[PDB]
Enzyme design. Sequence first.
Site, PDB file in Angstrom:
ATOM      1  N   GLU A   1       0.801  -1.295  -0.048  1.00 33.98           N
ATOM      2  CA  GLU A   1      -0.069  -0.021  -0.052  1.00 33.98           C
ATOM      3  C   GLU A   1       0.851   1.202   0.119  1.00 33.98           C
ATOM      4  OE1 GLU A   1      -2.977   0.793  -1.464  1.00 33.98           O
ATOM      5  OE2 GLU A   1      -3.868   1.296   0.392  1.00 33.98           O
TER       6      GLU A   1
ATOM      7  N   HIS B   1       2.022  -0.695  -5.139  1.00 31.93           N
ATOM      8  CA  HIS B   1       2.330  -1.793  -5.949  1.00 31.93           C
ATOM      9  C   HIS B   1       1.862  -3.243  -5.358  1.00 31.93           C
ATOM     10  CE1 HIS B   1       4.580  -3.766  -9.164  1.00 31.93           C
ATOM     11  NE2 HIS B   1       5.019  -4.606  -8.119  1.00 31.93           N
ATOM     12  N   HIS B   2       0.715  -3.645  -5.722  1.00 31.47           N
ATOM     13  CA  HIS B   2       0.363  -4.733  -5.230  1.00 31.47           C
ATOM     14  C   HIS B   2       0.715  -6.231  -5.657  1.00 31.47           C
ATOM     15  CE1 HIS B   2      -1.852  -1.264  -4.609  1.00 31.47           C
ATOM     16  NE2 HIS B   2      -1.913  -1.354  -3.291  1.00 31.47           N
TER      17      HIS B   2
ATOM     18  N   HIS C   1       1.757  -4.109 -13.633  1.00 34.13           N
ATOM     19  CA  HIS C   1       0.789  -3.971 -14.665  1.00 34.13           C
ATOM     20  C   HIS C   1       1.186  -2.778 -15.715  1.00 34.13           C
ATOM     21  N   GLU C   2       1.352  -1.617 -15.063  1.00 33.85           N
ATOM     22  CA  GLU C   2       1.641  -0.222 -15.818  1.00 33.85           C
ATOM     23  C   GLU C   2       2.516  -0.414 -17.081  1.00 33.85           C
ATOM     24  OE1 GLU C   2       1.753   3.211 -12.618  1.00 33.85           O
ATOM     25  OE2 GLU C   2       3.253   4.095 -14.106  1.00 33.85           O
TER      26      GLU C   2
ATOM     27  N   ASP D   1       9.012  -4.073  -8.641  1.00 33.50           N
ATOM     28  CA  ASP D   1       8.733  -5.583  -8.241  1.00 33.50           C
ATOM     29  C   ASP D   1       9.830  -6.160  -7.548  1.00 33.50           C
ATOM     30  OD1 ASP D   1       6.219  -6.120  -9.692  1.00 33.50           O
ATOM     31  OD2 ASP D   1       7.405  -5.716 -11.376  1.00 33.50           O
TER      32      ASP D   1
END
EC number: 4.2.1.96
Lengths: 99, 99, 99, 99
Positions: D53, D57-58, D75-76, D84
């Site tokens: 959070e 970046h989940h 994703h972006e 990551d």
Amino acid sequence: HRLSAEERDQLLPNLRAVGWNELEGRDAIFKQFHFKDFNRAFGFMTRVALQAEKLDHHPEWFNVYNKVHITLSTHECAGLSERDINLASFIEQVAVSMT
Amino acid sequence: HRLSAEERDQLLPNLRAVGWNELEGRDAIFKQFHFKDFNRAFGFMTRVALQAEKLDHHPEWFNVYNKVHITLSTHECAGLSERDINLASFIEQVAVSMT
Amino acid sequence: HRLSAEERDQLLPNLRAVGWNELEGRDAIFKQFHFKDFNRAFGFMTRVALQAEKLDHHPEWFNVYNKVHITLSTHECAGLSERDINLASFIEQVAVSMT
Amino acid sequence: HRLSAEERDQLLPNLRAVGWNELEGRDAIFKQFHFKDFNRAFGFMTRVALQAEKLDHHPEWFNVYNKVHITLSTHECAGLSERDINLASFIEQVAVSMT
């Protein structure tokens, strides 16, 4: 510890009615939750985490951001137990809280 | 930035309207939440933790079972900054989901 | 139930050695924990919180950023019971890892 | 900002070394953690979520009791990224402190 047809027809419906569904080649139920966000989704998870610890009944679940997929099956019986029915039921009280 | 005047009198009122009291002998606001059980109590704690960590504004909170007392003051200023404000609302909103 | 002094003498020392310590105006144990940051502190709360619910034994606790003050006592008896000791033991474990 | 060929090489090492894998099919790294219990697993999930959070970046993680699978991809920019990586490293520190 094993949902007998009777049990099933009495128990399953209220959950079936909300989104819970039985799986194929495995006695277990599933349902997909989709919250607005991670704050809520994790909040929801935590509350479920607490109870599962409390009951010693854990869910097979996956999350990404604001989506949370839950799958319920009891280990011994190797299918559904009353134990799945309440956790679900519980899961449900919790969910409708966020949403 | 140590909320000034008109703001305290623009912002605070809304908070007092909802039960936010001003702390005695400190530039701070505080409020205590009563939940039904610890399960809700902690679930509420988590949503807030996530938010707190996200804005880098951490409350002062004391919990007992199903009771959560929260105090908001900005360290940087040693008083009511906007941070407190925003945290309090997010808090309010969260309160409602469980409450 | 409420520990006898023989009991107090058996279970206490180890917790005493570790940093646990009796409260003056009442029959309970206190202990203030300090961690690097909130993540760790909240992370630690969450683990006792699960345990606390597992056992149906809750603490009185206070948190600011990376500091967490925990207070134990067995309400039902109005004083140290074995619950606080058990709990305390565990809180200790969790603690040691995050440090 | 999808990591470079140079980039990957200078980073993946350590993660590579720890058990983290690159996925055939997608630009993503993966790892499956195993703990002694759900408490630890969940405690783990928590610190991470806290960070997730923080960063925005989940993870894609699955959990079934004492084991957690993590998949990271940005994703972006449709593949692995500094993020990551970072987050991944962090996942590691936290994991260590679980025993």
